[PDB]
Amino acid sequence: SPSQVRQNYHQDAEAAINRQINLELYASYVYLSMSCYFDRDDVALKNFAKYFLHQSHEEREHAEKLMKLQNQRGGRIFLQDIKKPDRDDWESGLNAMECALHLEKSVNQSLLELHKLATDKNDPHLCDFIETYYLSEQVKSIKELGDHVTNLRKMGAPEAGMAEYLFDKHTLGH
Amino acid sequence: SPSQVRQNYHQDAEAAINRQINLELYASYVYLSMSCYFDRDDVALKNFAKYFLHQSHEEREHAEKLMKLQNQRGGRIFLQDIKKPDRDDWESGLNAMECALHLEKSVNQSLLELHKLATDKNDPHLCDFIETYYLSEQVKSIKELGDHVTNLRKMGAPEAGMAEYLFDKHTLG
Amino acid sequence: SPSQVRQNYHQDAEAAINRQINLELYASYVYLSMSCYFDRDDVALKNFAKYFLHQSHEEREHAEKLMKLQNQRGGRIFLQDIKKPDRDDWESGLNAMECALHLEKSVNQSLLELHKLATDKNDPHLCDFIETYYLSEQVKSIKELGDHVTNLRKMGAPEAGMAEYLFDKHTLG
Amino acid sequence: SPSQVRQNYHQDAEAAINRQINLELYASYVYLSMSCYFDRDDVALKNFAKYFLHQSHEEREHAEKLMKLQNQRGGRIFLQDIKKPDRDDWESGLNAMECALHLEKSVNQSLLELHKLATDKNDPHLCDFIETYYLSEQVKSIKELGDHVTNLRKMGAPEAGMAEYLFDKHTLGH
Amino acid sequence: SPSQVRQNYHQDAEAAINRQINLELYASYVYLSMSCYFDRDDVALKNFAKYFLHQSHEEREHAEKLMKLQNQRGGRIFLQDIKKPDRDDWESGLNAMECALHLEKSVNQSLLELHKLATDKNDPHLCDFIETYYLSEQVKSIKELGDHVTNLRKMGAPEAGMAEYLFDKHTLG
Amino acid sequence: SPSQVRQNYHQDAEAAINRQINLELYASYVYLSMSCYFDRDDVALKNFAKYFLHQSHEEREHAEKLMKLQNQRGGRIFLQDIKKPDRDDWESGLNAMECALHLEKSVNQSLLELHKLATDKNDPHLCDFIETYYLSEQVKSIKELGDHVTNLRKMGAPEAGMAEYLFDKHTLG
């Protein structure tokens, strides 16, 4: 029998929120893997490491916000395994930025499908939640990553040895 | 060929550190599940939720410290799936504290086996690392959880309705 | 049946901790006796009295830390009589410093045997506890006492009347 | 031959002061035992533990004040064994408060006999010392302990599980 | 006849501490040589010079800490000649970082042998001293040097003329 | 071929500066040995130890200033072994002060020969450098040491047991 607070919250939306929680946790774990990679002594880009660690924590925050939403609407959180990232070795700062861009666009696509579903179920609170706390942030993150990829490519990374070093210092070091 | 920094770091220790990283991440995810449970409208113990969320973040910090150790010694981090917790529904504040106590003692046991291995491989830096940043913290956490279980039991939880409410306010608030 | 928190804590270690608690309490009582002695009107060295009173309180703190350890690991504290010091009359500042040096080295030896036992039982938390909070402090205290004995002897104490007076003022004041 | 400072200080008073020093040390050790008991993981009342630890330190201070008195009057301190407390296991917060009340009243009785002796020996400095620094403090401590016993009993301790917990928080947690 | 403070301190440990003191002094002198090299007008990398001068002073501090340990345990310090570094001319910032990495790993190896010896002699105070003040610092220094070597190599040093200049400004400045 | 900055700097001056660098380093090591000696538990004069440790660091600073001069004038620093001090055991505070006085006067004599050489080679910058940063400091140090020797002797050291103790407290404290 439904939660005492549950109103206008379709079971399909509940399931899709649980899937999105898992995806945010997965993204957090991918960024954590990237951060570990740039901390290796044979890579040693401290500001790449800092950048992706920050991203990892932000993705965890996103997941926790979705869990709060789920309880607030009277849904029930069902956690699933967090799959390991597709790679141990991220090959270069440029490659990691490109993979992060791909990841962020996949997360964005999942959010857009979630918003489609909430619109189809006439759930304006959920639509507004997604728009307010997620869509704008994704567009910003995607644009940032695209900018970084563009600059790294123009500087000549990975092959120009100086490029990732100086990008680490100037763009990611403030 | 070995990392330029690698010295006196046995492949067995490297593997065991990777396993411990996974275990800390798993513990973080268990505590996150508990925290979500006490945020439910039909449970609604805000300070239980806060407590376990804090524990979740601390476990993530422990994992990140182990990853830093791994890179510092020239090992290579290999991540694995983080398995889902054994339960969605943690049944009561007392039950969650008991499960957390069990979890912390399993993590402690894994750390003790890691210290055994480092001692067997004559790796004093790793032994000292475990002693300094892990063993003492585990003993403290286990003692705290035991205390909470004891008080909850004596108050009459879960069946005495007032017990978890007042414990939430007094001890965890 | 064992405490809910007890893990990897051997009954022999528990017993040895209780013995060490008693020894620390005994040391506290010895230093208290010394302090009383230098407060006598026919001795009247106020800074010797202060020094040994400080040592007495520090030894009590050491005992209380061991009791906390015992409860933290799930052992049970069993107190015993605190025997009276071997002497009422400590004869001179030099003699008291020499007796304190002997006492501190006996306490150190007991701690070293405790660390041996913890190592034999593969109890790294207890080993680390002893190393961290006890061994270093003992080495420091022993060195300090040795220094004081050396200076007092060189100054000509007890027989040079000025020596303990000036040592009281300069070193201990 | 007597101390150069000794005046109007009877050997019987000196002996009785040494006995009182031992009793204060014993009381300190009893309270230390109680404090250890409430720190056990299967008891776990932190404010009971704090309370009795405070009492233990206060009893040690009382003993040290008596030792100072002894040297001030030119008596000589003779220490004796400090006997172990009668119990390892203090059974409950109520039981420990009751045992502490009994202990404090025994210490008070010893102080009253000491004051009787000082009065019989016409030693007004010692009488005043006892009155000023000891008797009033004992009456206060006894009244406090009686109050705590009364409240614990009325709350239903030990059998009402909530009683010692809430007393720990409200009365002893200030 | 032994020092009044000496307890549980084996003659082999005393000798090994004296050898380690000499090694730390030697390391200090090597880093001083490197620092002088980067101050040459035909090299002129001020932040390399600063970096290695800092390292030189830190190595001297390490030696002085070992001397304090030696006196604290009642051993006797016997100094030996400090041999001159193997090179006057360190060839480049990358080469100096590589030689420093090699040096730090040799010092680490000597510390590990010292810890082995202290463990074999059952000297927990000395083991803890080494772990606490030396091993962790060495692992950190080795990791740092490895990082610097990695970055310099990737930037194209020594042959890319800009590399050491910009590394001097960004990483070491 | 000469350094681009080298002007009016004779090869003999360069060699003599390298010798002086070695002598300053040697002096630093002698004072370090003295400092260690007064830290022994059977000597235990803390302010003698502090005093000579300060002197050791000052001598190292002198050496580093000479190395800077060498690079500034375009000479090349060639380091040599730093020989061990002539003694492990400095026997007493008075004896150590006397040996320090002898050492400082030998360093002064070497500086005077260096100034003679610079004057003979018509190198006014080097002459001024020696006068400004070295000669005056040496005269001051020699006078100070002479004062300390005089007072220690008059107090009756080493044989008057109180003398070095009180000198440690009053003059060096």
Which residue type does E171 have?
Answer: T
* Cα angle value E168/E172/F2 (rounded, 5°): 40
Do E140 and B72 lie within an 8 Å CB cutoff?
yes
Q: Do chains D and B touch (3 or more CB pairs under 8 A)?
A: yes
In chain A, residues with a C-beta closer than 8 Å to the C-beta of E163 are: 161-162
Q: Who contacts E41 (Cβ-Cβ below 8 Å, separation ≥6)? A: F3, F4, F5, F71, F74
Give CA–CA dist C173/C167, Å, rounded.
8
Nearest CA in chain D to B142: D41
Q: Is D102 exposed, middle or buried (0-12, 13-18, 19+ CB in 10 A)?
A: exposed
Q: Do B143 and D41 touch (CB under 8 A)?
A: yes
Helices (H), chain F: 11-38, 46-72, 93-120, 124-130, 136-155, 161-170
Say which residues have a Cβ less than 8 Å from residue D59's Cβ, sequence separation at least 6: D24, D25, D27, D28, D31
Q: Is F7 annotated in some ligand binding site?
A: no
Residue carrying the six token digits 């990553």: A145
Cα separation, C66 vs E142, whole angstroms: 38
Single out the residue of D99, D96, D93 nearest to residue D165, CA to CA. Answer: D93
Would you call B4 and E149 a contact, using CB atoms and an 8 Å cutoff? yes
C-alpha distance from C27 to closest chain F C-alpha (Å): 23
Closest Cα to residue F76, out of F114, F21, F152? F21
Rounded Cα gap, residues F34 and A65, in angstroms: 66
Nearest CA to CA, how far is C25 from chain B (Å)? 25
Q: What is the 3-state secondary structure (H, E, C) of chain E?
A: CCCCCCCCCCHHHHHHHHHHHHHHHHHHHHHHHHHHHHCCCCCCCHHHHHHHHHHHHHHHHHHHHHHHHHHHCCCCCCCCCECCCCCCCCCCHHHHHHHHHHHHHHHHHHHHHHHHHHHHCCCHHHHHHHHHHHHHHHHHHHHHHHHHHHHHHHHCCCCCHHHHHHHHHHCCC
Q: Rounded to 10 degrees, what is the CA torsion of C100, C104, C105, C111? A: 160
Inter-chain touch F41–C146, beta carbons under 8 Å: yes
Best of B117, B129, B139 to mutate (most C CBs within 10 Å, chain C): B139
DSSP-derived 3-state class of residue B82: strand
User: For chain F, how many structural domains are there in total?
Assistant: 1
Residues 6+ apart with CB under 8 A from B85: A79, B29, B30, B33
DSSP class of B84? P
- Which chains lie within 8 Å of chain E at 3 or more CB pairs, if any? A, B, C, F
φ, ψ at C82 (rounded to 5°): -95, 110
Sign of the alpha-carbon torsion through A163, A165, A166, A170? positive
Residue F148's CB: how many other CB atoms inside 10 A?
A: 22
Q: Using a CB-CB distance cutoff of 8 angstroms, which residues of chain E are in contact with residue A43?
A: 150
Facing residue for D83 by CB, picked from C53, C64, C81: C81
Q: In terms of C-beta density within 10 A (0-12 exposed, 13-18 middle, 19 or more buried), how is residue D153 classed?
A: middle
Cα angle B9-B12-B17, degrees, rounded to a multiple of 5: 80
Beta bridge partner(s), residue D82: C82
F50: tokens are 């502090």
- CA nearest C161 in F: which residue? F162
- Search chain A and give the residue with CA nearest B83: A81
Rg (CA), chain F: 18
Using CB atoms, pick whichever of A36, A77, A83 lies closest to residue B77: A36
Q: Write b or e for each residue in A19-28: b if 16 or more Cβ atoms lie within 10 A of its Cβ, otherwise e.
A: ebbbbbbbbb
- Please report residues of C whose CB lies closer than 8 A to that of B130: 124
Q: How far apart are the first and last CA of chain A?
A: 53
Closest chain B residue to the Cα of A75, Cα to Cα: B40
Query: What method did the depositors use to determine the structure?
Result: cryo-EM
Chain centre distance of CA C103: 7
Angle at which helices F46-72 and F11-38 pack, to 10 degrees? 160
Judged by DSSP in three states, F82 sits in: strand
What HEC string does C51-86 produce? Answer: HHHHHHHHHHHHHHHHHHHHHHCCCCCCCCCECCCC
Query: Which domain range does residue E24 map to?
Result: 1-173
Inter-chain residue contact B155 with D161, CB threshold 8 Å: yes
Question: In angstroms, what separates the C-alpha of C64 from chain B's closest C-alpha?
Answer: 17
Q: Which of C6, C9, C15 is nearest to C113 (CA)?
A: C15
Q: Which bin fits C153, alpha (ψ -120 to 50), beta or left (φ > 0)?
A: alpha
CA distance A117 to A123: 9
Handedness of CA D9, D13, D18, D23 (dihedral sign): negative
Q: Measure CB to CB from residue F162 to each of C143, C150, C155 and give the nearest one.
A: C155
Largest CA distance in chain C: 63
Within a 10 A sphere around the Cβ of A174, how many other Cβ atoms? Answer: 6
Query: Angle at which helices A161-170 and A93-120 pack, to 10 degrees?
Result: 60
Tokens of B41: 């409208």
User: Which chain A residues are closer than 8 Å to B60 by Cβ?
Assistant: 60
Q: How many contacts, defined by CB atoms under 8 Å, are there between C and E?
A: 41
8-state DSSP, C131:
I
- Is the N-terminal amide bond of A2 cis, ω within 30° of 0? no
Residue D138 annotated as binding site: yes
Q: Is A82 helix (H, G, I), strand (E, B) or coil?
A: strand
Residues of chain E contacting residue F81, judged by C-beta atoms under 8 Å apart: 81-84
What is the DSSP annotation of A85-151? PS-S---SHHHHHHHHHHHHHHHHHHHHHHHHHHHHTT-HHHHHHHIIIIIHHHHHHHHHHHHHHHH
- Helix B161-170 to helix B136-155 angle (10° resolution) is 140
Contacts with B64 from chain A: Cβ below 8 Å = 32, 53
Contacts of B40 (CB under 8 A, 6+ apart): A71, A76
| CATH code assigned at A139 | 1.20.1260.10
Chains B and A touch (3+ CB pairs under 8 A): yes
Answer whether B41 sits within 8 Å of A4, measured CB to CB. Answer: yes
Tokens of C1: 């049946």
Q: Is the Cα dihedral D78, D79, D81, D84 positive or negative? A: positive
Mark yes or no for CB contact C125/B109 under 8 Å.
no
CA dihedral for A153, A156, A158, A162, sign (positive or negative): negative
Instruction: Decide if C147 contacts C102 (C-beta within 8 A).
Output: no
Q: Which of F33, F64, F81 sits opposite E84 (nearest CB)?
A: F81
The DSSP code for C160 is S
Round to whole Å and give the CA distance between E108 and A131: 56
Structure-token match 């690392």, residue found: B129
Residue A59, marked binder? yes
Structure tokens at B29: 């995810």
Identify the closest residue of chain D to B161 by CA–CA distance: D162
Closest CA to A13 of A58, A75, A60: A75
CA distance C97 to chain E (A): 12
Cβ distance A50 to B9 under 8 Å? no
Chains A and E touch (3+ CB pairs under 8 A): yes
d(CA C111, CA E146): 40
State the Cα–Cα distance between residues A98 and A153, nearest whole angstrom: 10
Any chains having at least 3 CB pairs less than 8 A from chain F are: C, E
Tokens of C19: 């013995």
CA dist A120 and D147 (Å) reads 67
- Give dist(CA D148, CA D8) in Å, integer: 42
What is the C-alpha to C-alpha distance for residues C98 and C109, in angstroms, rounded to an integer?
17
Smallest Cα distance from A129 to chain E, Å: 43
Interface of B with C (CB under 8 A): 101, 105, 108-109, 112, 115-116, 119, 127, 130-132, 135-136, 139-140, 142-143, 146, 149-150
Q: How far apart, in whole angstroms, are the C-alpha atoms of residue A51 and residue D5?
A: 77
Q: Which of D41, D71, D83 sits opposite C39 (nearest CB)?
A: D71
CB-CB: which of F41, F161, F169 is closest to C154? F161
Q: Are B70 and B14 in contact (CB under 8 A)?
A: yes
Both structure tokens of F84: 């061990």
Q: Which of C108, C102, C107, C77 is nearest to C87 (CA)?
A: C102
F92 near F43, Cβ under 8 Å?
no
**Crossing angle, helix B136-155 and helix D161-170, to 10 degrees?**
120
Alpha-carbon span D44 to B137, nearest angstrom? 19
Phi and psi at residue B63, in whole multiples of 5°?
-60, -45
Looking at the DSSP bridge assignments, the partners of residue B82 are A82
Residues 6+ apart with CB under 8 A from D72: D5
The span from the CA of D101 to the CA of D146, in Å, is 7
D59: its two tokens: 């009893």
Residue of B nearest to A61 (CA): B57
Structure tokens at D154: 């009325």
Locate the chain C residue with the closest alpha carbon to F170.
C170
Q: Cβ F41–E85 below 8 Å, yes or no?
A: no
Q: Which residues of E touch F (CB under 8 A)?
A: 3-5, 29, 32-33, 36, 39-42, 53, 60, 64, 67-68, 70-71, 74, 76-85, 88
Cβ count near D12 (within 10 Å): 13
Place of tokens 């006999």: D113
- What residue of C is the nearest CA neighbor of F161? C155
Which amino acid belongs to residue B80? Q
Instruction: Name chain B contacts of D162, Cβ cutoff 8 Å.
Output: 155-156, 160, 162-163, 166
Long-range contacts of B65-71 (CB under 8 A, 24+ apart): B65/B133, B66/B17, B66/B20, B66/B21, B66/B24, B67/A32, B67/A36, B67/A39, B67/B21, B68/A39, B69/B17, B69/B126, B69/B129, B70/A36, B70/B14, B70/B17, B70/B18, B70/B21, B71/A36, B71/A39, B71/A40, B71/A41, B71/E143
Task: Tell me phi and psi for residue B82, to 5 degrees.
Answer: -95, 110
Residue in chain D nearest C31 by alpha carbon: D79
Instruction: Report CA-CA distances (Å) from E51 to B65, B106, D153.
Output: 27, 45, 71
Q: In 3-state terms, what secondary structure has residue B72?
A: helix
Q: How far apart are CA D105 and CA D118, in angstroms?
A: 20
Resolution, angstroms, 1 dp: 1.8
| Concatenated DSSP letters of B132-173 | IIIIHHHHHHHHHHHHHHHHHHHHTTTTSHHHHHHHHHHT--
- Chains touching chain D, criterion 3+ CB pairs below 8 Å: B, C
A131 is in an annotated binding site: no
**How far apart, in whole angstroms, are the C-alpha atoms of residue C162 and residue C150?**
16
Q: Exposed, middle or buried: residue B135 (CB in 10 Å: 0-12, 13-18, 19+)?
A: buried
**Pair of tokens at residue A94:** 């440029």
Q: Is D82 helix (H, G, I), strand (E, B) or coil?
A: strand
From CA F76, how far away is CA F70, in angstroms rounded?
A: 6
Question: How many CB atoms are located within 10 Å of the residue F24 CB?
Answer: 24
Beta bridge partners of F82: E82
Min Cα separation C126/chain D (Å):
18
Q: Cα(F98)–Cα(F91) distance, rounded to whole angstroms?
A: 11
